[PDB]
């Protein structure tokens, strides 16, 4: 029986021994999986909150782990007020560890208590505490509550700004503190203020870790709050062509990959032109391969029709088609094939044979080595020539002939 | 697509019975299939639609050229059977 | 709980930094290379900055081979002019290693932080020795008492071994059972009181620094 | 107003890329519908115009997907409705046009004409879909005459703003209308099928102030499992 | 990479086919 | 023959058989006719032609050069193939270094093959190559020349050890590479600082830097173990003076430097309008409120120290006046110090 | 209780 098993693991949490008590606490998610009944999940969560209120910090951490593992079941408790109140009663503990665990509880419960103002005030007060674990837990709770509540976000944006430009805050806690601005995707003026703060923040703290974290949270804000995307793309391209560090360029590359995977239609022709110009004058194959991966992701979408003779993208694809790196060759062949099968202009008749012979050269390079990385480029090339044969029928004879000669 | 092809095969045979044995006057409307981009994924599908087009063209060409008790009607339908079964 | 709540996630900044920086595949970083960086008689702090700043990006499972080189060179970190960032980073790496290998790590760190006047000064401190007498962890180099990143480590080991001695004494009591509960409780209470008293004596502004 | 500028930019991106392949057109319409839905979820005062334009682009996407079906590549006797998609598409476009016309407060004549144009396109698509599955000649002739009557009613009602719909469905119908009265109804169906694919996508004049008609009921409060008991045959 | 390769993408092994493989493989 | 089939290919199935033979030889090398093909190509290019035929049919020419480069890279110990290939590439570029050719993929592939091969050599001395790079930066632009010289200097620092550093020359070279925005700046800094860099980076930061300032800030954080430990005058000029990266350096110095360094800094900062008052008061306020000091839970100053504090606060007030809110904000610090 | 300040708000069940 459900209630019989509930009593069976309920008798263990007055055992006095901490081991059987943590036993009793951590058996709860299995009970929630077996018996998803709201009147029973309610009673289980209320007594979990009671043993959270009276237990030590390890029991509180066990309750926190249970709450994290049972996030989909805590929307069906419906005695929210007294449960949250008896958890919240030990925000007033003088123990900073207990305060940190309660902040992690509030952040874990932020899906079912948005606009709960005493929780917001506790997070705001604990963000200025002198204990590192409490401040980290307050940052975690603020990140959770900013995602679930816009009234929390509008004031906490100003607070996080003022404690980022506050130099008493150390650099590592600043690094943990930047991605709160990712959840500013509630209001247009809120996202604009967050973008202004991030623009001042990148040039104010030009550290490599700072620019990685700030650019990634700026692009997560731009992807979530959709009216930020062209300026974010042009900012990423500017930081890809100007910032000399390889890590910053690598984040710019993977970030433009994310933005091309999400919203390829919002790329302008100038953005593709700037990315191509970045791929021309780079000396590193590790960055050129990533840039060509972004351009090959863009090539399989409608961004080519927005981009469109022989342009910088075509010249770049021809140059990267004949490259000693197999990945760069595969990406250039993919761009050439997508351009060839995308439209039927007069200019692509010349590069059709270029795509065919680049495919054949990639086949003769990727077949005799049996490397694990060679098979991926071989699969890319063979998929590209399948697409070339299907999209344009007449030249399939040469593709079949070179496959037979390579076999 | 294979199940649809079998269904279209027996539908073709039923229509070939109707349009030139039972009632050629009531049947044989403007059933001109808009054969544009024949995006047939398999060779079997290509053979089936080629057979369908050939049989439909024969039925339309032999709609009212003969009396409903005809040797050409039985021959064209009964060879449409062979054309349908020739493809494995 | 302090050794467990540090595993709780904050904002995803660490996974991001690991993904964007550990992929540099500059595989020169190794326990041998870090040991050579420490063992330079003209010691350079810049190289050990670079190595341990790279080490902070590593996961706890892949920080295991660096435990010996990180612990056994902690005596050099007290040598009157070691930068605070080196000590803070070493404390961070020790806290990371504490989540996956604490029973070994405490023994290695206790053996590392001896005064080392003699050749060994009892380098054979086992786990059993520290569970028998947790106050061994307070018999350190005595320069650690003004090194807060090593006070963090030694207080962690002191709290851990004070907790472990209770379980060890209960296990020894049940094994030798084949009253003594009162004597065990008195021993535990006196042990914690002695630890608190020694900790408070560490807090005193000693007369060498007074004048 | 960055949100209004983005909405205008996305709409003109849809309008200016109406020369692509059907797959690319479907991809662009899906992207812009998703962006307009999320913009409506973000800017509250633009939510009504966002889902208004989203429903219009959904109508156009359904029309494009219905016009690119596998049933046009098979003959009329080989057509089978048990795997049909366009018949549901025409009904969906009708429902979306009614939803567009009547659950939006800020509509005017300059939007009602495009709404009724899309309704006419949906009626033509349903006419061709029903003509695929009909073997008799007189019911096909019947609703072909009904559709031409509807087109005549549309040209009579909306004759003022006819010179704004260049190259659309209705004006290209009006060019071939004297042929359309004198044409055999199967040829009418064929020319309609070939002329929907060549019809140009229209433009929506954006209203200044427009909101969705929203309704929520709170007093029934459908979250209590307690039954509401009464005597059989009496009233509650 | 054929999209309709039966032998390829054998991650979705059925029940009858798996038993058939186990029966006709080691023989 | 060989030259017969080169005249058959570029001015087509024989090219595929040629491609297959090259693939066969590379397969045999990695497991257990290339040199003859390269010799035939060299002897054909020595006689003045084919370069326009290979330019128009670049999709038969570039795979052959790619296969030759792969064979050159797979056996670098086979000396003679690499040198002959290098002369072939240089002669091919020399025939293609013409104004009107409408060069495309073939020219770029030959250019990158030359940059991969000829720049791999080690230049003789660090000082001479660094002076050559300084001159190449100093003429006008020389981007291909700058790229070749920085590749040579990178190879020299990777292989050879240190030389006559001449830190003014290093500073001038780094400033020139920053002003021309060379993509090899990070490699050059890494190779320079792997084998007094504090003075060089501080003098570079104290001087436009633009987007390259972040790399120098990262190096200054990383090569200097503390923030103000070596040549402290430049670091006090970096931190407190009348820079966009300054708050990051202040945030470092408040938390990375030791207590004697912080005490010496506040002594020299308090005990002339040399220092910026806003950064000075912010640094003092953050130094009082270090979270390590207050974890789990008041600094005495001398007479002239407190005096210098109060006219520093006054100077901050007048440089803000160019209202009383910032004076009220600075009041808690003067209350805490007194 | 040692975990709560004397001036901390009381908990009323």
PDB file of C-alpha atoms in Angstrom, chain A residues 19-113:
ATOM      1  CA  UNK A  19      21.986   7.355   9.205  1.00  0.00           C
ATOM      2  CA  UNK A  20      18.463   5.948   9.389  1.00  0.00           C
ATOM      3  CA  UNK A  21      17.085   9.485   9.276  1.00  0.00           C
ATOM      4  CA  UNK A  22      18.911  10.273   6.022  1.00  0.00           C
ATOM      5  CA  UNK A  23      17.796   6.823   4.821  1.00  0.00           C
ATOM      6  CA  UNK A  24      14.207   7.889   5.471  1.00  0.00           C
ATOM      7  CA  UNK A  25      14.675  11.247   3.734  1.00  0.00           C
ATOM      8  CA  UNK A  26      16.325   9.939   0.571  1.00  0.00           C
ATOM      9  CA  UNK A  27      13.818   7.102   0.091  1.00  0.00           C
ATOM     10  CA  UNK A  28      11.204   9.782  -0.734  1.00  0.00           C
ATOM     11  CA  UNK A  29      11.788  10.171  -4.545  1.00  0.00           C
ATOM     12  CA  UNK A  30      11.161   6.446  -5.092  1.00  0.00           C
ATOM     13  CA  UNK A  31       7.871   6.855  -3.217  1.00  0.00           C
ATOM     14  CA  UNK A  32       7.035   9.867  -5.391  1.00  0.00           C
ATOM     15  CA  UNK A  33       7.745   7.835  -8.526  1.00  0.00           C
ATOM     16  CA  UNK A  34       5.650   4.885  -7.335  1.00  0.00           C
ATOM     17  CA  UNK A  35       2.657   6.832  -5.959  1.00  0.00           C
ATOM     18  CA  UNK A  36       2.044  10.174  -7.740  1.00  0.00           C
ATOM     19  CA  UNK A  37      -1.016  11.139  -5.696  1.00  0.00           C
ATOM     20  CA  UNK A  38      -1.369  14.846  -4.793  1.00  0.00           C
ATOM     21  CA  UNK A  39      -2.943  14.296  -1.359  1.00  0.00           C
ATOM     22  CA  UNK A  40      -0.029  11.967  -0.508  1.00  0.00           C
ATOM     23  CA  UNK A  41       2.758  13.957  -2.178  1.00  0.00           C
ATOM     24  CA  UNK A  42       1.420  16.885  -0.134  1.00  0.00           C
ATOM     25  CA  UNK A  43       1.770  15.084   3.206  1.00  0.00           C
ATOM     26  CA  UNK A  44       5.190  13.709   2.260  1.00  0.00           C
ATOM     27  CA  UNK A  45       6.469  17.168   1.299  1.00  0.00           C
ATOM     28  CA  UNK A  46       5.051  18.735   4.470  1.00  0.00           C
ATOM     29  CA  UNK A  47       6.812  16.244   6.721  1.00  0.00           C
ATOM     30  CA  UNK A  48       9.969  16.595   4.612  1.00  0.00           C
ATOM     31  CA  UNK A  49       9.761  20.327   5.276  1.00  0.00           C
ATOM     32  CA  UNK A  50       9.263  19.643   8.990  1.00  0.00           C
ATOM     33  CA  UNK A  51      12.335  17.404   9.220  1.00  0.00           C
ATOM     34  CA  UNK A  52      14.148  20.072   7.193  1.00  0.00           C
ATOM     35  CA  UNK A  53      13.162  22.642   9.817  1.00  0.00           C
ATOM     36  CA  UNK A  54      14.214  20.525  12.802  1.00  0.00           C
ATOM     37  CA  UNK A  55      17.084  18.509  11.313  1.00  0.00           C
ATOM     38  CA  UNK A  56      20.784  19.210  11.065  1.00  0.00           C
ATOM     39  CA  UNK A  57      22.493  20.521   7.947  1.00  0.00           C
ATOM     40  CA  UNK A  58      23.217  17.110   6.412  1.00  0.00           C
ATOM     41  CA  UNK A  59      19.546  16.174   6.704  1.00  0.00           C
ATOM     42  CA  UNK A  60      18.745  19.557   5.178  1.00  0.00           C
ATOM     43  CA  UNK A  61      21.083  18.741   2.291  1.00  0.00           C
ATOM     44  CA  UNK A  62      19.349  15.377   1.858  1.00  0.00           C
ATOM     45  CA  UNK A  63      15.997  17.198   1.753  1.00  0.00           C
ATOM     46  CA  UNK A  64      17.529  19.541  -0.836  1.00  0.00           C
ATOM     47  CA  UNK A  65      18.666  16.621  -2.999  1.00  0.00           C
ATOM     48  CA  UNK A  66      15.203  15.051  -2.724  1.00  0.00           C
ATOM     49  CA  UNK A  67      13.568  18.364  -3.680  1.00  0.00           C
ATOM     50  CA  UNK A  68      15.878  18.729  -6.686  1.00  0.00           C
ATOM     51  CA  UNK A  69      15.140  15.150  -7.766  1.00  0.00           C
ATOM     52  CA  UNK A  70      11.385  15.668  -7.280  1.00  0.00           C
ATOM     53  CA  UNK A  71      10.877  18.988  -9.059  1.00  0.00           C
ATOM     54  CA  UNK A  72       8.009  17.769 -11.254  1.00  0.00           C
ATOM     55  CA  UNK A  73       6.053  16.402  -8.275  1.00  0.00           C
ATOM     56  CA  UNK A  74       6.229  19.525  -6.093  1.00  0.00           C
ATOM     57  CA  UNK A  75       3.740  21.368  -8.315  1.00  0.00           C
ATOM     58  CA  UNK A  76       1.018  19.080  -6.893  1.00  0.00           C
ATOM     59  CA  UNK A  77       1.231  19.704  -3.143  1.00  0.00           C
ATOM     60  CA  UNK A  78      -1.276  22.624  -2.893  1.00  0.00           C
ATOM     61  CA  UNK A  79      -0.487  23.321   0.773  1.00  0.00           C
ATOM     62  CA  UNK A  80       2.185  25.692  -0.447  1.00  0.00           C
ATOM     63  CA  UNK A  81       1.976  28.407   2.212  1.00  0.00           C
ATOM     64  CA  UNK A  82       2.697  26.421   5.377  1.00  0.00           C
ATOM     65  CA  UNK A  83       5.248  24.159   3.646  1.00  0.00           C
ATOM     66  CA  UNK A  84       7.240  27.130   2.337  1.00  0.00           C
ATOM     67  CA  UNK A  85       6.793  28.904   5.689  1.00  0.00           C
ATOM     68  CA  UNK A  86       8.263  26.040   7.715  1.00  0.00           C
ATOM     69  CA  UNK A  87      11.164  25.749   5.269  1.00  0.00           C
ATOM     70  CA  UNK A  88      11.619  29.539   5.315  1.00  0.00           C
ATOM     71  CA  UNK A  89      11.695  29.695   9.133  1.00  0.00           C
ATOM     72  CA  UNK A  90      15.373  28.642   9.093  1.00  0.00           C
ATOM     73  CA  UNK A  91      16.456  31.473   6.845  1.00  0.00           C
ATOM     74  CA  UNK A  92      16.830  33.302  10.182  1.00  0.00           C
ATOM     75  CA  UNK A  93      19.377  30.811  11.511  1.00  0.00           C
ATOM     76  CA  UNK A  94      22.733  32.233  12.544  1.00  0.00           C
ATOM     77  CA  UNK A  95      24.376  29.285  10.769  1.00  0.00           C
ATOM     78  CA  UNK A  96      25.488  30.419   7.286  1.00  0.00           C
ATOM     79  CA  UNK A  97      25.410  26.813   6.051  1.00  0.00           C
ATOM     80  CA  UNK A  98      21.749  26.463   7.035  1.00  0.00           C
ATOM     81  CA  UNK A  99      20.991  29.780   5.332  1.00  0.00           C
ATOM     82  CA  UNK A 100      22.770  28.546   2.199  1.00  0.00           C
ATOM     83  CA  UNK A 101      20.795  25.291   2.184  1.00  0.00           C
ATOM     84  CA  UNK A 102      17.537  27.224   2.579  1.00  0.00           C
ATOM     85  CA  UNK A 103      18.478  29.528  -0.295  1.00  0.00           C
ATOM     86  CA  UNK A 104      19.071  26.433  -2.411  1.00  0.00           C
ATOM     87  CA  UNK A 105      15.643  25.166  -1.299  1.00  0.00           C
ATOM     88  CA  UNK A 106      14.022  28.436  -2.352  1.00  0.00           C
ATOM     89  CA  UNK A 107      15.790  28.323  -5.709  1.00  0.00           C
ATOM     90  CA  UNK A 108      14.709  24.702  -6.075  1.00  0.00           C
ATOM     91  CA  UNK A 109      11.120  25.680  -5.221  1.00  0.00           C
ATOM     92  CA  UNK A 110      11.132  28.802  -7.425  1.00  0.00           C
ATOM     93  CA  UNK A 111       8.863  27.113  -9.982  1.00  0.00           C
ATOM     94  CA  UNK A 112       6.002  26.987  -7.454  1.00  0.00           C
ATOM     95  CA  UNK A 113       6.659  30.168  -5.473  1.00  0.00           C
TER      96      UNK A 113
END
